[PDB]
Amino acid sequence: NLYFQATLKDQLIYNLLKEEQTPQNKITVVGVGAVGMACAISILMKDLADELALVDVIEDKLKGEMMDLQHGSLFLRTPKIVSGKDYNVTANSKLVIITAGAVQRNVNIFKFIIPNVVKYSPNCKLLIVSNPVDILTYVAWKISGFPKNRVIGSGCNLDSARFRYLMGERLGVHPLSCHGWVLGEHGDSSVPVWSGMNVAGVSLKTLHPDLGTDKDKEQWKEVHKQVVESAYEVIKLKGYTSWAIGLSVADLAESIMKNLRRVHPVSTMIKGLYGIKDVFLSVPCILGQNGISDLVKVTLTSEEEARLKKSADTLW
Amino acid sequence: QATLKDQLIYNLLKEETPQNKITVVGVGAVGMACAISILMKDLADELALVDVIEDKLKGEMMDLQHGSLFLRTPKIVSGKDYNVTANSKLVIITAGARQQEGESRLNLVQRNVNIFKFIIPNVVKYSPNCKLLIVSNPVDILTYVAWKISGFPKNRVIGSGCNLDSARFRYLMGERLGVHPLSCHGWVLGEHGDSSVPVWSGMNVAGVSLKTLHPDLGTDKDKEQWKEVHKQVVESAYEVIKLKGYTSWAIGLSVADLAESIMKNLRRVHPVSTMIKGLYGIKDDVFLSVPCILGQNGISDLVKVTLTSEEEARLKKSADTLWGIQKELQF
Amino acid sequence: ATLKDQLIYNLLKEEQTPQNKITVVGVGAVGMACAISILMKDLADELALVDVIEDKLKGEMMDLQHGSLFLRTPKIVSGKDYNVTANSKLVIITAGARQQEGESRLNLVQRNVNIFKFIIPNVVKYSPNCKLLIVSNPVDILTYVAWKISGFPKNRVIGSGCNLDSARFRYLMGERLGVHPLSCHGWVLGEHGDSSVPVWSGMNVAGVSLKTLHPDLGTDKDKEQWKEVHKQVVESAYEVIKLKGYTSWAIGLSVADLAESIMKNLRRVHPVSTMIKGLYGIKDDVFLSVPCILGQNGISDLVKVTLTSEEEARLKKSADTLWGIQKELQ
Amino acid sequence: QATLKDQLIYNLLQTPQNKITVVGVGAVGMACAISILMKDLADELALVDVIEDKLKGEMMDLQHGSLFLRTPKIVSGKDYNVTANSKLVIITAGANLVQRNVNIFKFIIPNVVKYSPNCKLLIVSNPVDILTYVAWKISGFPKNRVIGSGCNLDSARFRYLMGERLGVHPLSCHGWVLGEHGDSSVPVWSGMNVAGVSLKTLHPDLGTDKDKEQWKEVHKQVVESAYEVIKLKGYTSWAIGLSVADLAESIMKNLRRVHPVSTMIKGLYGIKDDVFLSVPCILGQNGISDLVKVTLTSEEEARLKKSADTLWGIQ
Ligand SMILES: Cn1ccnc1C(=O)c1ccc(NC(=O)C[C@@H](C(=O)O)c2ccc(C(F)(F)F)cc2)cc1
Ligand SMILES: [Cl-]
Ligand SMILES: [Cl-]
Ligand SMILES: [Cl-]
Ligand SMILES: [Cl-]
């Protein structure tokens, strides 16, 4: 180091600039558990970030994960993958995905996580994935001071995806052509909007008025029951759920990063709509570079809205 | 009573074979990494998962199915019975014993050779025309075992080999040179293990030989100590296993890279495990990585790399290290 | 020994039938738009181009081949002889006289019918198991034609139909509502032409009936004049021809969208041309667009859309228009 | 009117973060536009030209296929207020085409830099080597943000022909054509290889007159490629469209891949003038960040000085 050494790089490369240039489409993932890495690989293989930053308190695992993704750089189009306990690595993130945690036991963690994120990434959109996403989305919105539009919770984007996959299995149609929405709490009190289910615009409830009721001879209510028990079943089998939620988060990050303005059922403040006064639950929202820029005023039945009011009641 | 599906859909074809079916055997961290990477690259219209651990098998299958909306692979199945792998174009075998911290891949021979005695005959039974892509370790030896048990022609028995070692080597090249690995060209050949051989004479950027600009490239007298780049490649697996307990994402992307060239018949060059009896004066039925052309028929061609005395010797040494084990077994 | 032999050791002289081959018939602006879209979506391992123009055919092939470094389709063949189309899984037929400015797609019938009498039999000879994706106009009538000449079951003969008409309709929806066309759901059925039918009763966003919130949706007494959105869809092809002389990119993406569903057996729903005999009282062998489940066997199912008496009447009229032209053919 | 929208959408609330502009909507410009759209490189694409009809027709045709894309905003117009905040601007407008095209550049380059000051310039109009110098002088940008397509396609053609001869995908065939994007391009035979195996080492007569296999034809085909395609279909568009979109990917994503694009090579291979031509450069978000110093033989370096002297003459 004391002596001047002629480098192979100097013989080969002639330099013009010397600026990191600040990242343009950077994304950060807080938490490198199964869910965290699932979101990381899905984002990496969708070419959504020119720089990926991983952060978690377990530094031995954090480094191994980073090195594992870095070794596959040849097969990716994301030219920079960094990690580190210090949240300085997350500077200039356009989107921060939070999957860290094990409600109070996790709300404390948000106190130590959210400010660090907001410190180095003030203009970034928050995508809360940690459970209960309905409440922790309201938390990160209070601990951060960000405008509600830039505080998104994953919410029921996966519940609806599960709901449409089950629709397809019953109809022999790809879920892309099975339209249906699961709203409310991302949990046992989710609300299936039976009045919107359709294929090619044909309302199923109109064909089958018993749809979703107990008199339904086909028991389409079991479909929502499966959407609720899904995570319970996969967890009891493999110990956790990761692939499904990872693909869901990446599809949200796609709408946000690329500013597509697609409609997703993500958590957000619903003060006023449906008579609810108080805090955060999922509804169809347009998603773009500014996060939730709009809401869709879905016309719910009295029974549907009743459950939603019951879902918001359960939440706090 | 008419059902909702009949009120909605008028059927024409009451039928149901798949054209680009891929099977992943073993749903460990490696198998499931290959699965997700293949699913997200749209290489198959049907993905089959096979493993003995049924509880984890179904859970992984279900977890993948729930993301169907976000994928372009309309069918995902699983089961302990190999009949679910019928008519696969490509069978990726990842099941077996993986190395623990500090453990060498060659210490897995006895265990995985015994497992391959039960896997290969069943895969071959239901997919006699598929291409076998072996990932289980030690891959170089298990590729030879899979080729002996299967009875397939050597072109349809490929081992992932050094496709990842070379990817790691090119990544470390990119970090030193500040270039994307895609434009950093370097080959790690031989065993997918401690005896891998770096071909310094073939390293280049934009066709500029690096050993010509730096004649000490890869030697002990190298002031830049480029020999350490290959040391990291060899230690890579151990370093990551020591940090997170296993490897998954890098191998999964590498296997997906080979599957892409096989399924799409690209005829790209890859360093994959194949028999090299006759090349470089090697007279034993040994398998190891040389650059091969990969297509819908598997390994259709080998590229004969030009090696120096040191490089050719290190490759003959890597073969002797492997044959010393293949000849002690019973398969 | 040659340089190749000094460098490459061979193991397999045996070659295999192409596994995911697609053929595009016609190297016009429409055919080449389908070809470039299919290449950049990695739907095939072999692309074959066929046409009667020997010069333009070779030039288009070379122009694609020279960009092979940036594609994942390792074989691009072409030629006036249809033997280059052998073993195709999907044959996309775009050849034929195209719609000139002001002209109606229905004036091209007799010209392209004679052309299809030459194209279809040669295609069927070398790819008897393929799906036929008809794009030539009028696509609805020409789908019926290709089905009669080919002898295939009607599930393997598909017309691009109103897959583009519905895509154009959903783009205008998003423009008005400020939403991505993906999240704006609306269907245009019937003829791929002037007699198309907008299904207002199905229009929705996030499963919210728009006609329910706005009962006057699409009617003459409509405050927001939504019937114009459909009028734009009908006239879109005309306004595009007047500005650049033809339509290419949009149809190319729509056709590539259908090929994806077919080649990958996705079983998505698409509004494509097929026999609707048995729907809405129709008893004739008339072809037009309704939502169909597309897979590796082509059209496996049809969706029975619940239409209003006004929408259904429009569809009947559209069918009568095409049936009046179909029965007068040899 | 728009009363239904407020019945359905409850509002809560920007400039583009990944905008790209393609000046000129001819066969090349549209081939570049379509290639960029189907690679999801831009969140906004802007088409600009002078013929108001064709400009709108192309915009509409692309807009109709928006459902099949992920580019949520496609705009066009004659005024360059559409190209504002562009991170990359591809210049294809134009028609021995020096006098005609240099005139057009004097009119376009000023307007582009106005609304897009921090953008990178990707010059595709021919002669690309000279017009990259022209665009650089008129723009005032630092030479790292003025890129010419150059021999990126020439190398993409040189590769392929290699593939056909060897039975290998061009991805695994490596060869570099440098110099002027034209008849004076220089093929670096010393760098041709498959999997690091120098073809020149296995076959010393490679590319020379004594070549028994006549590999010099491969480069001849590359030089004649554009002529032969124009002679058959009347123009080239697809290959150059895919080539430009490849450069766009490295720039828009800051990949730092090596491409043989046209840039100033003052101080290399014996050149003190301000001449632009093709060498392997590393492309990223800031354009050409570095150059690769390819070791050229005595004959290779000779051709480059002549290909540079003539080019500089016009310049
Ligand atoms: C280590 N490992 C990882 C993954 N798999 C392994 C194994 O060792 C392994 C080794 C052998 C198997 N055999 C089968 O699956 C048998 C199966 C089939 O062949 O279909 C079958 C199904 C139904 C019947 C019937 F009709 F009689 F009921 C008979 C046979 C499975 C796993
Ligand atoms: Cl490699
Ligand atoms: Cl549609
Ligand atoms: Cl390579
Ligand atoms: Cl050109």
What residue spans define the domains of chain A? 22-153, 157-314
Annotated ligand binding at C206? The verdict is: no
Phi, psi of D106 (to 5 degrees): -60, -20
Tell me the DSSP string of A223-245: HHHHHHHHHHHHHHHHSS--HHH
The top-level CATH class assigned to B163-326 is: alpha beta
Residues of C with a known catalytic role: 192
Token pair listed for A298: 């879905």
Among B52, B114, B125, the mutation site with the greatest number of ligand 1 atoms within 8 A of its Cβ is B52
* D30 CB-near residues (< 8 Å, 6+ apart): C249, D22, D58, D237, D241
Architecture in CATH for domain D15-148:
3-Layer(aba) Sandwich (3.40)
CA distance to partner chain D, nearest, from residue A171 (Å): 24
Closest to D205 (Cα-Cα) out of D193, D194, D214: D214
CA distance D158 to D174: 9
CA distance D96 to D32: 23
Ligand 5 centroid distance, CA of D226 (Å): 6
Among left, alpha and beta (phi > 0; psi -120 to 50; other), residue B295 is: beta
Burial C44-65 (b: 16+ CB within 10 A, else e): bbbbbbbbebeebbbbbbbbbb
Token pair listed for B244: 């997170």
CB C168 within 8 A of CB C232: yes
Annotated ligand binding at B111? The verdict is: no
From chain C, pick out residues whose CB is under 8 angstroms from the CB of A261.
174, 178-180, 183
Q: Most C CBs within 10 Å: which of A169, A194, A202, as the mutation test of the C interface?
A: A202
Please state the residue numbers annotated as binding site of D for substrate. 126, 157, 236
- Indicate which residue of A71, A174, A179, A186 is catalytic: A186
Tell me the DSSP string of B209-221: EHHHH-TTTTSTT
* B318 CB-near residues (< 8 Å, 6+ apart): B190, B191, B195, B196, B197, B288
Among B122, B123, B124, the mutation site with the greatest number of ligand 1 atoms within 8 A of its Cβ is B122
Residue B3: count of CB within 10 angstroms of its CB: 12
3-class DSSP assignment, residue A49: coil
Q: Give D278's strand partners.
A: D179, D262
Which atom in ligand 1 lies closest to the alpha carbon of residue B79? 15
Q: Give the HSE-up count for residue A51: Cα atoms under 13 Å, Cβ half-sphere.
A: 21
Method: X-ray
CB D252 within 8 A of CB D283: no
* Nearest-by-Cβ selection for C300 from B13, B265, B266: B13
CA distance B162 to B170: 12
Among left, alpha and beta (phi > 0; psi -120 to 50; other), residue A83 is: beta
Tell me the DSSP string of D52-108: HHHHHHHHHHHHHGGGG-S---EEEESSGGGGTT-SEEEE------HHHHHHHHHHH
Among left, alpha and beta (phi > 0; psi -120 to 50; other), residue A121 is: beta
Helices assigned H by DSSP within chain A? 8-12, 34-44, 59-71, 104-120, 133-144, 157-171, 204-207, 221-238, 243-258, 302-314
From chain D, pick out residues whose CB is under 8 angstroms from the CB of B199.
196
Residue A174: active-site member: no
Annotated ligand binding at B32? The verdict is: yes
Closest to D176 (Cα-Cα) out of D204, D213, D150: D150
Please give the CATH number for the structural domain made up of B21-159: 3.40.50.720
Phi, psi of C317 (to 5 degrees): -60, -50
Distances (CA, A) of C106 to A104, A263, C248: 69, 39, 19
Helix/strand/coil (H/E/C) assignment for every residue in D1-40: CCHHHHHHEEECCCCCCCEEEEECCCHHHHHHHHHHHCCC
Q: Most C CBs within 10 Å: which of D68, D198, D199, as the mutation test of the C interface?
A: D68
Specify the residue for token string 């459902």. D67
CA-based angle D237:C61:C252, to the nearest 5? 65
* B208 CB-near residues (< 8 Å, 6+ apart): A12, D191, D292, D293, D294, D295
CA distance B68 to D294: 48
Annotated ligand binding at C55? The verdict is: yes
* Nearest-by-Cβ selection for B306 from D168, D201, D256: D201
Phi, psi of D260 (to 5 degrees): -90, 80
CA distance B45 to C300: 17
Specify the residue for token string 């470094």. C69
Question: What's the CATH number of domain D152-314, 3.30.1490.20, 3.40.640.10, 3.90.110.10, 1.10.3260.10?
Answer: 3.90.110.10
Q: Which residue of A has its CA nearest to C291?
A: A200
CB C18 within 8 A of CB C122: no
* A188 CB-near residues (< 8 Å, 6+ apart): A228
Which atom in ligand 1 lies closest to the alpha carbon of residue B84? 20
Which residue, by CA, sits nearest to atom 25 of ligand 1? B81
Closest to B209 (Cα-Cα) out of D304, D163, D305, D188: D188
Among left, alpha and beta (phi > 0; psi -120 to 50; other), residue D159 is: beta
Please state the residue numbers annotated as binding site of A. 33-61, 131, 162, 241
DSSP class of C99: P
Among B30, B61, B82, the mutation site with the greatest number of ligand 1 atoms within 8 A of its Cβ is B82
From chain A, pick out residues whose CB is under 8 angstroms from the CB of D256.
79
Token pair listed for A162: 């599960």
Cβ D254–A12 below 8 Å, yes or no?
A: no
Q: Which residue of B has its CA nearest to A252?
A: B70
DSSP class of B190: B
Cβ A294–C178 below 8 Å, yes or no?
A: yes
CA-based angle B196:B198:B203, to the nearest 5? 155
Q: Give B302's strand partners.
A: B292, C9
Ligand 3 centroid distance, CA of C187 (Å): 7
Which bound ligand lies closest to the C-alpha atom of D170?
4
Among left, alpha and beta (phi > 0; psi -120 to 50; other), residue A33 is: beta
From chain D, pick out residues whose CB is under 8 angstroms from the CB of A21.
254, 284-286
Q: How many CB pairs under 8 A join C and D?
A: 176
Q: Give the HSE-up count for residue A122: Cα atoms under 13 Å, Cβ half-sphere.
A: 1
Query: Which one-letter amino acid corresponds to residue A31?
Result: G
CA-based angle D110:D114:D118, to the nearest 5? 115
* Nearest-by-Cβ selection for D257 from B183, B204, B207: B183
CA distance B253 to A68: 10
DSSP class of A139: H
Which residue, by CA, sits nearest to atom 1 of ligand 1? B115
Annotated ligand binding at B105? The verdict is: yes
Q: Is the CB of B51 under 6 A from ligand 1?
A: yes
Q: Which residue of C has its CA nearest to D200?
A: C3
Q: Determine whether domain A157-314 maps to CATH 3.90.110.10.
A: yes
Q: Determine whether domain A22-153 maps to CATH 3.30.530.20.
A: no
Radius of gyration of chain D (CA): 21
- Strands C46-50 and A151-153, by their bridges, are unpaired
Which residue, by CA, sits nearest to atom 19 of ligand 1? B82
* A312 CB-near residues (< 8 Å, 6+ apart): A184, A185, A270, A274, A276, A278, A279, A281
CA distance B255 to B294: 12
CB B143 within 8 A of CB B287: yes
Residue B6: count of CB within 10 angstroms of its CB: 11
Q: Give the HSE-up count for residue A111: Cα atoms under 13 Å, Cβ half-sphere.
A: 6
